[PDB]
Design a protein around this ligand. Structure first.
Ligand code: ADP
Ligand code: CA
Ligand code: CL
Ligand code: K
Ligand code: MG
Length: 379
């Protein structure tokens, strides 16, 4: 029975399996190769993944996301206190551990972050089981290189609750390197930069790999920069367009904004492979339909500063690692936002034209490497 590799992400999670000499990333029931790390509580059910994210605008108080931002932290942690200001769901203190408090099955219930993440992992486990045709019991799960013992412990606990034997907790940048077979040479240092621009966070890691041993040389980035920030630039653009067309400001209507955000995220994805995208939202605000379009060039203009801001943490990491740009052997793209052509251009330009490792979907690279590692650990 195959062990699985799971990327338990801030915004999306991904599962893969190594068998018959290759990794396959496993599509969910909707055919999506990544699944939102969202859980929704209703009067009768728990919805997880696509079904939860799809009703986020409808049920904001009882739809939980960003659990990875809480996992393994104390309630009074200044990170927790800050992030709480921005979430539509309630977080409460239970013995200096945060819990998310929701209405569920007609009662007030609270859940630890690891319990929320266990639900996401159960969904990822089920996705794998539907594909494999049998129960999965062993997994490798990934975490950011900056996670401390408590954060690693709580991630493992999520896996255990989900019913998995967690073979190992490994770092996301390590898993990305494993995906590209970067740990297979013997003696001789190989310097690798992992540039990981996700849905909510940006992580740059420089690893030196010597005879299969990984050393973290430097890390940099921004825990609050990611694809949601690009979606938001599109949201504000279309808010202005709606004002010009209808003389109505929708920006204070939480549901209209969330629905617009959903449409913008879809359009953004299309713009990575097409030069234009259409948005069509029925009954956006006061029953008015919104149908519009966006070009790739306009999207790039709207986000130009944000894309550019990703280069300075690369500069800082290189400085900390005491390496010149030219000394990096491999540049590895991770995170779904690195599928944006402008982001690729900026990074490749910064590195004076060096190849980008992007043959594995960047949003799947971590799960891919976790699957390879799970197979190695199973023998
Ligand atoms: N083809 C694409 N083009 C641009 N952005 C994308 C694309 N596919 C996914 N994304 C974005 O990637 C982000 C999620 O990245 P991912 O690496 O899957 O999750 P996480 O950051 O939680 O690990 C989301 O903002 C999503 O909209
Ligand atoms: Ca942000
Ligand atoms: Cl450019
Ligand atoms: K992910
Ligand atoms: Mg990620």
């Amino acid at each position: 029975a195959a062990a699985i590799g799971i990327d338990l992400g801030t915004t999306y999670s991904c599962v893969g399996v190594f068998q018959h000499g290759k990794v396959e990333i496993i599509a969910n029931d909707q055919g999506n190769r990544t699944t939102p790390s969202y859980v929704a509580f209703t009067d009768t059910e728990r919805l997880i993944g696509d079904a939860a994210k799809n009703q986020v605008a409808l049920n904001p108080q009882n739809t939980v996301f960003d659990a990875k931002r809480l996992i393994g932290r104390k309630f009074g942690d200044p990170v927790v206190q800050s992030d709480m200001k921005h979430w539509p769901f309630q977080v409460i203190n239970d013995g200096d551990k945060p819990k998310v408090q929701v209405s569920y099955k007609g009662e007030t219930k609270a859940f630890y972050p690891e319990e929320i993440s266990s639900m996401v992992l159960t969904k990822m486990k089920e996705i794998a089981e539907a594909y494999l045709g049998y129960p999965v019991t062993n997994a490798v799960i990934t975490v950011p290189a900056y996670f401390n013992d408590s954060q690693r412990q709580a991630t493992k606990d999520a896996g255990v609750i989900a019913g998995l034997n967690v073979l190992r907790i490994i770092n996301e940048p390590t898993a990305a390197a494993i995906a590209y077979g970067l740990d297979r040479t013997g003696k001789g240092e190989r310097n690798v930069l992992i540039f990981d621009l996700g849905g909510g966070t940006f992580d740059v890691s420089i690893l030196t790999i010597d005879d299969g041993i990984f050393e973290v040389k430097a890390t940099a980035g921004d825990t609050h920069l990611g694809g949601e920030d690009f979606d938001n630039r599109l949201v504000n653009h279309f808010v202005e367009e709606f004002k010009r067309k209808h003389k109505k400001d929708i920006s204070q209507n939480k549901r209209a904004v969330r629905r617009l955000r959903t449409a913008c995220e879809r359009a953004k994805r299309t713009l990575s492979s097409s030069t234009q995208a259409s948005l069509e939202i029925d009954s956006l605000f006061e029953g008015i339909d919104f149908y519009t379009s966006i070009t790739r060039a306009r999207f790039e203009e709207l986000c130009s500063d944000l894309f550019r801001s990703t280069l300075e943490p690369v500069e800082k990491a290189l400085r900390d690692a005491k390496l010149d740009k030219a000394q990096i052997h491999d540049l590895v793209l991770v995170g779904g936002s690195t599928r944006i052509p402008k982001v690729q251009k900026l990074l490749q330009d910064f590195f004076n034209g060096r190849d980008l490792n992007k043959s594995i979907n960047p949003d799947e690279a971590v799960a891919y490497g976790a699957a390879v590692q799970a197979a190695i650990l199973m023998g």
